[model samples]
Target chain A: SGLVPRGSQILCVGLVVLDVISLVDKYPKEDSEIRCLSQRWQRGGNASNSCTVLSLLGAPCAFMGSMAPGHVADFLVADFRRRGVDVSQVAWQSKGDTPSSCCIINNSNGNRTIVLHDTSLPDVSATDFEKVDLTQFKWIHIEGRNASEQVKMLQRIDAHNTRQPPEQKIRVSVEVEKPREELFQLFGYGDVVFVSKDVAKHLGFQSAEEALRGLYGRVRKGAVLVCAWAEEGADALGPDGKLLHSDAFPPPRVVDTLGAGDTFNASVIFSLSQGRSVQEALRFGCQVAGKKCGLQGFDGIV
Target chain B: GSQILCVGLVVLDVISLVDKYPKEDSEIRCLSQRWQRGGNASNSCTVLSLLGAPCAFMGSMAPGHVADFLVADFRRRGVDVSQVAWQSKGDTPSSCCIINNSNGNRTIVLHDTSLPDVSATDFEKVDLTQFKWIHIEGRNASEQVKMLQRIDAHNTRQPPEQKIRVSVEVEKPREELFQLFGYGDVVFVSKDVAKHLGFQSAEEALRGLYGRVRKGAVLVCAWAEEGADALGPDGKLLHSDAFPPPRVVDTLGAGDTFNASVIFSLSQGRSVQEALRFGCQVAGKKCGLQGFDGIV
Candidate 1:
């Protein structure tokens, strides 16, 4: 019923959340009081944010995720609609509150501590995938919020790979923010993997290159690995196992560190999805990330 | 607590104080510039927070851009952010306001033009019973009206214990006046807004406006120079003269301050007549300040 063509571009799978962020001079002390220097509320989620960013970069994308039932969900859906993201495939749960994350920023340095309250997001089940046309999408980016569901999604993609024509088979990319014990299995299903340095450190790596190398060994053959280092340029290992690095673009000013990585991932994926070379993708990613730092929230910068 | 939620657009206003508002096509230097988060919903929430009310914002924000400044501003305030949504794809919404210190007047020029509309599903996640008050601005009136209807329906089916108080702030589009009045419990209108809505006088307009509203709700009309008036549930007319505060510095949050004070007073069990006075006092105090930063 919508105007957009069915699965004309990428389909992003993950949670859609509203992010409320407050900026304070420093973290509140145990017994001391502090006031917010600034505050904002906006639409945010790894998958949703990326979808919007990709659309902004000229890629028509769709979002496939669970949204809470009420006005917040309405807000997100309307946002996606306004941005031209296909929301027809989005699975809206009948119950459960829309998931949300709160971030408290230390304005002194733009560092933030986020508190996530999203246990209610339903698991992506087989029934959820029944209505989806996986073959229509050129690519699918999955956020690691629901690893089990993501694994299942990847499995479905893998299964579709055998039946779909070579040009129609969707390329899978997964973003891992936290430790996933089953990451190894998921890696085998992904065409590309994006991990942050902290995630790599938690998985036992000292540097971005080391982390990418460690992850590279476990991924399927021909899968690319990219590790993002805060402030430092991101490091990527191509399918040929050749290490590539891109320096960070210096921002005019740093407003908040939130969502910088999401922008980077979105830009890089968008570039690569459009057939941009590895170096071009990396440069675009860095530029997106750099521009993101100048704004207070993800939506503001773009 | 009742089950109503407020969500919509907000912008950070970089306000500069001047001795007089410049003429069209003329440039004038400001005495000083200050930044404050200003928007229909944002100002409402900011004032709500000051009145010691608990509320959440549900709206889209631009990530990694100037819009984040407004998000950070709201967070710093005590308003709940559990329902905020984000879009990393759009430019941040912002504006520049030139305030005249001599007369507590201002002119605004908005820069961030792309306002992302919130979807209907976004409200599905909210627990209406958890909130007692729901205040929405008419920035996106079409969307806000849909939400108001939803809240009204929920309030209708539920028992008194479960019903929430719903309020709407009228911002623009003269024709939508009746629609807002019909849905809101307490409808606030400024002097300029009252005139735009086709009423010759505040009192006349308020009474006429209340006729289209749901029974038991109040209609408030604010006059910048004359203070505010109210038409209570009993259909009684109540008016309070403006209590000019100290020397005016910035008047950006004056309307919001007034609305919040009235709501706060009402919540605290004050009479509608008393609430009007309290609101005037609050707005007066706000005029003495530079921005919403210290309104509380």
Candidate 2:
């Protein structure tokens, strides 16, 4: 029997942007101009891209994010619609520009420099998440860009948990790439915390292990702490202090590393939501990341 | 700063890629998709900006539902829209294009809602001297004609060299074609539009059309597949052979590209005959691409 029902869906919330990617030998130096060998543009953002990845992997997903008015935003929204991702919760901001990100990839080394041009902060209210039919979804993913909104959403989830049977409680996962000093307040809300190695260090932890240990202590009992260590692979720590690790599946050929981490995080979430064991989830995540590494841009894989 | 003002509509174009062009009453499935912002005047202003001209767009924008699509598009391409007025009602103008990749041609179904038109009063408050040229489309001919009259009056009070040149494109048939002819310094009409006005050929069209209107200005007519033909004040025919590009990806902005290039070349002191050739080249380059995104 399957752990999750066939109708299970995931809800993702955060920023959405139209990503323009260019392949080059290397990033331009200071005050230097460069030309790209090839270019492609697609929809991207932490929450949007993850939701798209999950949908591509046979998971039913929905996205809630901020979008500005215009053709680029139309492109992004149309992409989500075509991918079969539900986007009823996306809000349009009246003022500030809709965010767009540029990812410059060095084709030779597969390194990337991301330039995020999002001037408008996502405005997702707690009431918006509160209206979501949680029973319809088995998992919820939140990118830490809108931490306050997420915290409010998490509080609602917690309140809802008190009324539901333990077996019916929905799983919550968080992906944090940047260091948010205020993020400590929301850590207790996540069932699985996926933190980048750099973010772990920024949180004052010396290593991935230390970060997992420190995070697991503050979260609920049995919650998983996962630290994504760039090229070193990923490690997940159990509440009982059991450490499980997966080595990076050497990519066929690295192209653009821009959204590799998001790909990894989404794959693990999809695997775990499908009831795969931690070890199995790690393998799935590595496989997804490896596939992404061979692609030219963040969106080429999907 | 090269002052050229363009006024008209901006729209979000939703294009669906199809394997082949579908016949009437036939159903077809799409292979892929792409969406971008486009409009006649907006495309012209965008090209003008790319050609190193300081151009501005004055138009009414529909609020909500793909309105941001047009606004952000213009901003990215560096088109000035400081004079743009926003209307909260009405759906944003949109177009659904079925593109045939093999032939590089597209059939479009446009959904143009009645947007609030820009008025002559809006142009009256502006400094006319700042703009060396003005271009308008036929969609809002009433307001455009009134604004042209205001500019003409403004020019009459100034010295000859300081007067702003006006160009008008007869995108649609109107009852008062002669009214517009007197106001425009250069009038560009399509072969279809020219025929509708009772002209047999491009040369005859330019001469017959210019006879009833003001003299000393160039009258140009565009012949699709065949090049463009123009008539000088002396009624001499000047023909520029078609410089057809390899294949057309989207012909949506081809006319606007012609308008912008002719205006741009004119501002740069190119002769009327040379400007017609330049306009043909610009239109050729535009048709050779996909979407208004590559116009720059």
Candidate 3:
């Protein structure tokens, strides 16, 4: 796995825990024991997967988040270590056992019914950031939860950036996967923003282009706006108000849609670091996702 | 408990109400979620207690918050919980799901530890002679048949007052459990499970499984809304039209409600069809509320 001689160091800040994926013939119509064909546990979360892809692709990456110090977190730590991701920055005092996301996948048709376990840990505040020197990483990606507290950390990152020279500033990207009251504020903090279709719809846009254009008007100067819709394409608008588009690579068959978005996020950020235009980055991002979906699980990954 | 002993799975169902079933690789916002004691035996015992039968549940429940909640729930319902299997470790069968708010349909899945891979071996220590009616939910079928055979052996040796009547609910009948099906004094089958066995109608399935039961014993198949069909030991067909639920709050434990109602009414000297109608009405009224505690 020869990757480019890279100097880009990325820090992913968000949730990290075990994801239990169970494949069943169909969802049970009532409360009874329905047989599951298969079940497997893997690392899950937006920033977690993004960091994994970046590290495997040979970018120096580290994760920063809080999770309970339990058997599940131990698995995630070992997983990230195998991927060459630095886990020293992750906080491990979030109360009970590491949280879990149970993805009950229907085999007949593609659908993941998601249920999060108890113990959504408290967010790592700016005080927690004192444990890490923010000046070390060139890029930081945040998952949009506890956005209110994260906004203060965002400001702290900005203050760190403003003290440095223009060329040495750290770029921030935030992944908005769910809708919450204060989640919109996170979009303004990102130098590049990634959002789910729900976020775009909540921001009031029909097509990806309109969502891109709408978000472009609200984000910081020179911030790029990207929104991903299933199977169609991902669209982005750069700082110059120029729309960039990439046709999503059609998977041979759509077996899974899990982690596909994060594949795009990782690839896009990697391409941007390599000095590619937003157009090329989006293209490469879609290609990574398409190829990921081409396989049943996390195989054929770059 | 005196009359009915429900021996089988005990679970905790964490239910979330949603508009429609979630699609693959998508997010669904649930309307609400609540935790309740769930399982075929647990639900059945609740109904038996509500209808004033002295019933208790016997099943493998792990030592955890899930089991504690179930034990306390059984306690509050006036059902005896002192006799069931309790293990030091091993998860109780637990379910999580999205209940369709529009229609009462739910898309569900369950979780259990390796300990749930259980059979009749788990209940060998239970005293069968204390209960007049022993209703079982089919888990490890052939194993259950073997377990019931040993109990029947005891029944043949006991005095008439000490013998136990066996009824097993074969919701999903596999051919391996055919002998157990033959041994039951009253055999219960789901209409869907019976249809899955290739009968066009419940009556037809009852006829098909008639010889599967002991001579002069009844076989009953419960249909969802089409009511229930039973073949009395006399080879006479009994039919009860379903009382359509005015409003279905949740269909989670409706089948178990029907099972308990049938066994309760029949043991009280009601005719086969009368018990079937009582079952349908009980289950129908059960549909208008959540869980098995709707009737006082």
Candidate 4:
């Protein structure tokens, strides 16, 4: 409580889902069954992992999402609470089922394929977001999904910030990871925006710096845009039009690259909220994300 | 209609259709993939329900998304789930991963090592008198034995007309399943179980296994594409020719279809000979469809 002065919680709004992962030695021939080497049920989703990483970094975080009433939601919410994330804001649906992914990982080549089952579970609406007390959070991190609802929710955050004093205003950050046209509409809404390499490539940008420079005009004034390119580190362009880069601190051997981007985004948000300079936060993000790659999960990454 | 209870595993089946079987460590896109409710007893209950019989399924169901999918399917198909034995904890349901090649033949891999079978204690909760026939899968042989014993005890306490008819399937060749002999009033033997016992044909399998069952029990064996054979309690043998479909679409649940058809027919006072012919007809018609929809 005394070291760095804890800020209000960071609320991450997105999906939390179950991933049923199975590992196999190799793909088998037709009409033959092969025993999987191992199998596990893991909590997954972009916003979900960001909350986990943020919590592991000693940041107070809350996850806001929607799921049907079932054990899949039970497992995910319990895991989040166990990791020190607040899940009191979850929207429980009256019917339908939560999302799950049947993930098959190949042991020989380390390749994984996913078949996602989405039962049309409802997402949190802007009305749901409006019920939240804005004073309880200092930063709102939104995953770019359900673009129409997300837009309305972001506007609610904007309306709340308009009446608050400068120092008390909550910063809004958005992560655009998918290569969809609807998500680009989220660019002008965030004070801090994180875009992945996939989205960068979708917009014809070759590198992190190129992405930051190319999308600078689309964002609001005084906004900071960060783009992370795996293995090549990250780049950030600030309101001052200055582009900064940090070399990747790759681990000795990458064990898993899943959730690495979420780790980077959470690290940067955590660092910047703690009053670290953009350049310092960029370097910290690379260091933390690379450490996450060296391990299975966010545990002990700090 | 009299209600029939089917007891066995009800698993989440993940089916993926691909152009060819995947090679080692290669990432390939599937033509399509879907989630379906599948299990030996589960499929049997589905067929029984489709055939206008009041049917219910009893199995160990975990509380999770997978269970949600499976239970939803059961209800959608008009099968009763009030008798389902839900676990207090654990979200792991038995799952089957099936790969359908270009020609539509499926390769199935089963994963449910930790899911416990329904114990005899769980079976005790079921209202046995409400059911006219109880069909049990030849899995979890130890617990299956106890459950069957409970049914036998229930029958002993009742009069002739009130006693429930018992049926059991010997599909797998596990050594423990051999204990299921002498327990079933109607024993349904799969070709696999028959072959494992060194019986070359359905009639031979029935003749060889007849000595092991109770004196008045009927033994039936199904030979794929070779029709079926049955041995009556009085040493009368019945055989039916294969009712081959024009084109085999899916043979995934044909055996369960046959078993269910036989149970449905026999429960309605049809003779074992009629049940045998009806079973082959339904099972062959099942091969022409993708799922148990309109085979009846």
Mind giving the per-residue lDDT tens digits that candidate 4 earns over A1-302?
A: 12222347998999887777788787555555466777777888888999999999998888899888765677787888788888878888896667766677778987766555554778889898888777778889999988889999999888888998888888899988999999988989898988889999988999888889899998988999999999999999989998999999999988888899999999999998898999999999999999999998777698
Candidate 2 residue pairs that clash: A69-B68, A69-B69, A70-B68, A70-B69, A71-B69
Candidate 4 on B150-180: residue-level lDDT in tens? 8889889899988899899988888888888
Please list the residue runs of candidate 4 whose C-alpha ends up more than 4 Å from where it truly belongs after superposition: A1-7, A26-35, A94-96, A126-133, B1-38, B42-93, B96-109, B114-136, B140-168, B173-254, B277-296
Give candidate 3's error at residue A51 in angstroms: 8.6
- C-alpha-based local distance difference test score of model 1: 0.72
- Candidates in order, TM-scores: namely 0.51, 0.53, 0.64, 0.74
- Give candidates' CA RMSD values in order: 17.9, 16.8, 7.8, 6.1
Ranking by TM-score: 4, 3, 2, 1
| Candidates 1 onward: DockQ, in order | 0.02, 0.03, 0.19, 0.26
At residue A206, what lDDT does model 3 achieve? 79
> Per-residue CA lDDT of candidate 1, range A80-159, in tens?
88777888787777766576554556667756554444365575565687668664688888887656666777888788
Which has the higher DockQ value, candidate number 1 or candidate number 3? 3
Q: Report lDDT (Cα) of residue B274, candidate 3.
A: 87
The digit string of per-residue lDDT tens for model 1 on B1-296 reads 72225566767664556676553223344455445777667776787777677767777777653555666777887667777766656766654455677867766544444556676666666667678777776655666677888888888898876567777777554575457777777888766667766787878778767777777888898887688889978877999998887577666768878887787777666888899999998888888877765656
Overall lDDT per candidate, in order of appearance? 0.72, 0.74, 0.77, 0.83
True contacts kept of 1: 0.00
In terms of DockQ, which candidate is stronger, 1 or 4? 4
Going through the candidates in order, what fraction of the true interface contacts does each contain? 0.00, 0.01, 0.37, 0.33
- The lDDT-based order of candidates, best leading, equals 4, 3, 2, 1
Q: Is candidate 3 or candidate 4 better by lDDT?
A: 4
CA shift of A222, model 1, Å: 1.2
**What DockQ does candidate 2 have relative to the true complex?**
0.03
Number of clashing pairs, model 4?
0
